[PDB]
Ligand binder design. Structure first.
Ligand SMILES: [Cl-]
Ligand code: NA
Length: 129
């Protein structure tokens, strides 16, 4: 599924992301825009052989099992393919664990590079929330 802006923001808000660990809704929507372009089916292979999955590009070295990343942990305890679902529940559950891990949203390279310190409210302007 390719989410619309507002649509995604509403689903994220409904799953408890607004202000989760102090990151307002703008942040998560901005991170999704730049990580996946709002596409739940996005995958990207890294040179280390691991792969990023889904709307939040969650990585197979630590967070999910894809059965082709040697020496990987499955910290969110799901197959990676569950991350590519229409239903963002599993991505959101896993993200909440990634974001509590001590680094915050700096775990996502596109957030750090493209969202961090920008006006993130704009990603939630004009949306019925
Ligand atoms: Cl944090
Ligand atoms: Na893994």
């Amino acid at each position: 599924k390719v989410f619309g802006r507002c649509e995604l923001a509403a689903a994220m808000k409904r799953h408890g992301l607004d202000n989760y660990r102090g990151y307002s809704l703008g942040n998560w929507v901005c991170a999704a825009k730049f990580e996946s372009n709002f596409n739940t089916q996005a995958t990207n292979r890294n040179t280390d052989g691991s792969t990023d999955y889904g709307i939040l590009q969650i990585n197979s070295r630590w967070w999910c099992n894809d059965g082709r990343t040697p020496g990987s942990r499955n910290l969110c305890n799901i197959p990676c393919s569950a991350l590519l679902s229409s239903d963002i529940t599993a991505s959101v559950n896993c993200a909440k664990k990634i974001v509590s891990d001590g680094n915050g949203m700096n775990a996502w390279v596109a957030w750090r590079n493209r969202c961090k310190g920008t006006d993130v409210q704009a990603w939630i302007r004009g949306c019925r929330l």
